[PDB]
């Protein structure tokens, strides 16, 4: 419930850093074994 | 020259958000066509 908002926050941070828009950012989690991995992709 | 430091900044942001350490964060860019893609991976 809190992670979704942290992911949105990360989009803001990226938008400000490399001057991309929200549409140029992809964030998603995937299950890796017994743990999860958060993955971000930014088009530059 | 400035991007490396933004990437380090992103590590800080992630460390604070999902309470992971720097060793649990991987950030790297790859060339996609005529553009570049910034990719982040966080172990949760």
């Amino acid at each position: 419930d809190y992670l979704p908002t942290l992911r949105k926050e990360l989009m803001e941070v990226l938008s400000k850093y490399v001057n991309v828009s929200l549409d140029n950012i992809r964030i998603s989690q995937e299950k890796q074994d017994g743990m999860d991995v958060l993955e971000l992709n930014i088009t530059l």
Side-chain angles (χ1 to χ4, degrees), chain A residues 29-38:
Chain A
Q29 294 180 2
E30 295 185 358
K31 184 177 179 179
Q32 177 65 52
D33 301 316
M35 295 180 286
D36 294 322
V37 177
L38 177 65

Side-chain angles (χ1 to χ4, degrees), chain A residues 16-31:
Chain A
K16 290 178 177 176
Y17 280 7
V18 295
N19 296 314
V20 298
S21 70
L22 296 175
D23 290 344
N24 287 281
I25 302 168
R26 297 291 182 274
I27 304 179
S28 180
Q29 294 180 2
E30 295 185 358
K31 184 177 179 179

Side-chain angles (χ1 to χ4, degrees), chain A residues 1-8 10-18:
Chain A
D1 296 329
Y2 67 96
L3 288 170
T5 63
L6 292 176
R7 289 161 68 193
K8 290 178 181 179
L10 289 170
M11 294 180 78
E12 180 180 357
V13 170
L14 291 163
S15 181
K16 290 178 177 176
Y17 280 7
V18 295

